[PDB]
Symmetry: C2
Subunit: 48 residues, 2 copies
Amino acid sequence: VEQQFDLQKYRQQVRDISREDLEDLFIEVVRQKMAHENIFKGMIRQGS
Amino acid sequence: VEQQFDLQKYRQQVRDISREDLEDLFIEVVRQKMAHENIFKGMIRQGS
């Protein structure tokens, strides 16, 4: 629910943004979800 | 280290990508990240 709401406020925004301001928000994207894999790669690490 | 290559690599792809076409990978993303949000969360209420 709330998430769906969120994504929409970000495309409610993004639309208004700019080649580089989405560039960084985008570079920042993969600059996080890789952490959202290591910090998700540790949490599955406990499969022992 | 490695991911830092990853990063630099994801830059090139995006410093040529056009306006809207550099937008749809920011809408799919703030969906992305959140899917993990429920996942770390998922991961932390799985640990206790």
